[PDB]
């Protein structure tokens, strides 16, 4: 198989081989081992064949796989592997390196395959094997398809080993006006065929022969015999009767406008609707042609015609050969003035390129299945609460939603995250940016999924982790700035309701912890809300959406969540102790996201992205908002009060048990808060200083960041050497961001003594280890675990402190090297 790579020069033979092997695989009376060998050969070949050569095989698979019968299993794996391998060839605009780029026909076949499999799997009953085999294939195809790909040949009706039945033309009668048209187009076709001869150098004569270059029946249409008039009119009769069976109404509203004299129809141009009718005409022509070839196959007793695949599947060039006859017939109809009307939902859609985008239809289907999920989840909750019934009318839909949709959502919105975040001004992804409507649809999907999960984690059972992962992916892929600035009131209210409900649930958790509804709320929060809310806030802070998203009602809800968490922080309990880490992480992300300096409200009136500034004094009275920002929820201490308290605790050297709330909740909050508001406060880069700038809403300066880092180091060294301190790594991770902005004095003041103590402890422990090595047998066995535990705690302390040191070293490395520093030399020594 590997030798088959780069076999372009024999593409026809390779395609014939692939077709023959696929037929052998589909063959009957074949033992299981033989079928396995054939399937292995097909997969090995397709592994190495170039993606472009597999187009013809994909054309057959498009027809075969959607049935999703037993034979359909191997094609599913084949397509999965092929698309996973060649995802670049289809997705990227530049294409896979050295392999070219996909074509319009290949992408159209890919979409046909995806939607056929999706619909068949959705309608089919649940089967574990089929659902496990198909889902990877759907994910691979979705990843391969470009998010913004638009199919030129889109049919709203999307109607439909093969059925070659054409329409019953002979059954329906033919109007007399259409019969006159039949005669006129008959001599037109005669003249066009005469022009074909004159192009081929053929002329009039007594008989048809290649050497003669003459035709016997090329007499003028006036003397053109009676029989051949019928021969030439009969295809025209069949076409017109076909449109009549289609119930399309053709009316001669407008008056129609040897040596061959065929009128030139190229001037006449088919519109979208005319081109659609002519597409269907070519469809009927191939359908009758395939019926005849099926008759030939029946006479033979076997075999399959290579061109038996459907018209839409057939490549454009093959379509073109038959497209010529239908388009010429309809162009002549127009020239004669005949107008054909049927009515198209295709016109109803119109160009609608954005709606034609693949991701658009995918998200539409996802939202429809969100509605179905709401329905059957409501039914399941109703039955579980009382009147238990095992019928489960929506069992198939539940299995589909849980097994196919959720992994599909996860994979698709993990692969194409940047496409949905890119904006026309700035493009994050390789190419293409999601439309505003697509962004709104994904936001609606996230909100609907969150509402579906609300207080139903137990109902979702083992699928709750998958649903929460999908929520994480959707939140990370959610673009909120554009949705808020220009988005439907419905979707904006949906996201605002998500935030408000999150705030309410967190308030309920806080009050319950302070002390089955309580259990349900606690488990739902801890499992889905705090992680999902943390991810959403991290995304907003990272992408700077904070100033745009968190405004007005969102600001109110964020205030509530913020200081509700802070109030819970004061309370002492085992559940609170367990929950403290997640609450602290969520608080840190919220602090990094908020656009208002909550810690310092005295200078709020300068801030423009505040509810008080935006809303009029008459407003905020309809809402239950306090008149003064200070009262918005007083419990939060002021920024400088918090800084004084942290310094006091650090100087007092209290252990972790003394201030569990501080280290876990407050310190991460300040670590996230200080950099953000320094960037906006004094000492900041002045890009807007030349223009009129109001006084900064915040008073944070580099002094605050230096002091906080010093206090954090003091706390870590005070708690140095404790038996169990799991908070140390979290504190180091949360304190990294502030480390960049450490004054040079920090080295001497804090880092040198701390690393010195660590070095002293390491020396003592290694001395103990050497003494143990000197000892032997039980003396060696005893104390080995003691020195091992000492080494473990020392490693914990080093991994807590060194991550901060490395960042500090990097910023001051250049200055230390430029100007020799004895402090740097001593730190190197330690």
């Amino acid at each position: 198989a590997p030798l088959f790579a780069g076999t372009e020069h024999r593409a026809i033979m390779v395609d014939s081989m692939l077709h023959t092997v696929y037929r052998l695989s589909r063959g009957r009376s074949l033992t299981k081992a033989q079928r396995d060998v054939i399937e292995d050969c097909l997969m090995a070949l397709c592994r190495y064949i170039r993606p472009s050569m597999l187009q013809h095989l994909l054309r057959r698979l498009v027809f075969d796989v959607p049935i999703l019968n037993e034979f359909a299993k191997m094609p599913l794996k084949l397509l999965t592997n092929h698309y996973e391998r060649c995802w670049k060839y289809y997705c990227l605009p530049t294409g896979w390196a050295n392999f070219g780029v996909t074509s319009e026909e290949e992408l159209h076949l890919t979409r046909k395959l995806f939607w056929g499999i999706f619909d068949s799997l959705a309608h089919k009953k649940y089967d574990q094997e089929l659902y496990r085999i198909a889902m990877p294939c759907l994910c691979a195809i979705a990843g391969a398809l470009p998010p913004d790909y638009v199919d030129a040949s889109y049919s709203s009706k999307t109607e439909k080993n093969f059925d070659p039945r054409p329409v019953e033309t002979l059954n329906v009668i033919i109007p007399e006006k259409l019969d006159s048209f039949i005669n006129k187009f008959a001599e037109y076709t005669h003249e066009k065929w005469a022009f074909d001869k004159i192009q081929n150098n053929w002329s009039y004569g007594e008989n048809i022969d290649e050497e003669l270059k003459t035709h016997p029946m090329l007499r003028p249409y006036k003397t053109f015999s009676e029989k051949d008039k019928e021969i030439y009119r009969w295809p025209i009769k069949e076409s017109l009767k076909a449109m009549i069976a289609w119930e399309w109404t053709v009316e001669k509203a407008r008056e129609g406008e040897y040596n061959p004299q065929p009128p030139d129809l190229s001037v006449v141009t088919l519109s979208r609707e005319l081109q659609a009718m002519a597409e269907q005409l070519a469809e009927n022509y191939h359908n009758t042609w395939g019926r005849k070839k099926k008759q030939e196959l029946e006479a033979k007793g076997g075999g399959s015609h290579p061109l038996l695949v459907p018209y839409d599947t057939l490549t454009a060039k093959e379509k073109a050969r038959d497209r010529e006859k239908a388009q010429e017939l309809l162009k002549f109809l127009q020239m004669n003035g005949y107008a054909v009307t049927r009515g198209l939902k295709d016109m109803e859609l119109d160009t609608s390129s954005i709606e034609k985008r693949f991701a658009f239809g995918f998200l539409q289907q996802l939202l429809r299945w969100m509605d179905i999920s709401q329905e059957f989840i409501a039914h399941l909750e109703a039955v579980v609460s009382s009147g238990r019934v095992e019928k489960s009318p929506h069992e198939q839909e539940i299995k589909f939603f849980a097994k196919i949709l959720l992994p599909l959502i996860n994979q698709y919105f993990t692969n194409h995250c940047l496409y949905f975040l890119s904006t026309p001004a700035k493009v994050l992804g390789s190419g293409g940016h999601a439309s505003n409507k697509e962004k709104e649809m994904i936001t609606s999907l996230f909100c609907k999924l969150a509402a579906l999960v609300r207080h139903r984690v137990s109902l979702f059972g083992t699928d709750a982790p998958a649903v929460v992962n999908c929520l994480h992916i959707l939140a990370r892929s959610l673009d909120a700035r554009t949705v808020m600035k220009s988005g439907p009131e419905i979707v904006k209210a949906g996201l605002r309701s998500f935030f408000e409900s999150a705030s309410e649930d967190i308030e309920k958790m806080v009050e319950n912890l302070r002390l089955k509804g309580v259990g349900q709320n606690l488990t739902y929060t801890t499992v889905a809300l705090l992680p999902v809310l943390t991810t959403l806030f991290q995304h907003i802070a990272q992408h700077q959406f904070g100033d745009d998203v968190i405004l007005d009602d969102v600001q109110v809800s964020c205030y509530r969540t913020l200081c509700s968490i802070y109030s819970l922080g004061t309370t002492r309990n085992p559940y609170v102790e367990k929950l403290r880490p997640a609450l602290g992480e969520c608080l840190a992300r919220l602090a990094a996201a908020m656009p208002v300096a909550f810690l310092e409200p005295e200078l709020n009136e300068y801030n423009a992205c505040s509810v008080y500034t935006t809303k009029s004094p008459r407003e905020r009275a309809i809402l239950g908002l306090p008149n003064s920002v200070e009262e918005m929820c007083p419990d939060i201490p002021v920024l400088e009060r918090l800084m004084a308290e942290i310094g006091g605790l650090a100087e007092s050297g209290a252990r972790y048990t003394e201030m569990p709330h501080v280290i876990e909740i407050t310190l991460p909050m300040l670590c996230s808060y200080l950099p953000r508001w320094w960037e906006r406060g004094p000492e900041a880069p002045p890009p807007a200083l030349p223009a009129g700038a109001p006084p900064p809403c915040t008073a944070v300066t580099s002094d605050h960041l230096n002091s906080l880092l010093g206090n954090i180091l003091r706390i870590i060294v005070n708690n140095l050497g404790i038996d169990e301190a799991s908070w140390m790594k979290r504190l180091a991770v949360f304190a990294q961001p502030i480390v960049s902005r450490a004054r040079p004095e920090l080295l001497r003041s804090h880092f040198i003594p701390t690393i010195g103590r660590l070095r002293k402890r390491a020396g003592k422990v290694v001395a103990e280890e050497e003494q143990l090595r000197l000892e032997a047998k039980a003396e060696a066995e005893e104390g080995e675990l003691l020195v091992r535990d000492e080494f473990s705690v020392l490693c914990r302390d080093l991994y807590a402190l060194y991550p901060l040191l490395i960042r500090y070293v990097d910023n001051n490395r250049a200055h230390w090297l430029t100007e020799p520093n004895p402090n740097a030399e001593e730190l190197f020594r330690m």
């Binding site: 490395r813 250049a814 090297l817 430029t818």
Partner: protein
């Protein structure tokens, strides 16, 4: 050199033209079309 001392000097890296008594000569891609013999291994064009 502005950042050689900060990064590169201690790692043992040496300036490219450190001990060259004359400036290094350079060649640039001139965009003036010129007639040149058809390569004997040209992928697309063959002269017999």
């Amino acid at each position: 050199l502005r950042f050689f001392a900060i990064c590169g000097l201690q790692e043992g890296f040496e300036p490219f033209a450190i001990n060259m008594q004359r400036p290094v000569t350079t060649w640039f891609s001139k965009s003036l079309p010129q007639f040149e013999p058809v390569p004997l291994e040209h992928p697309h064009y063959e002269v017999a």
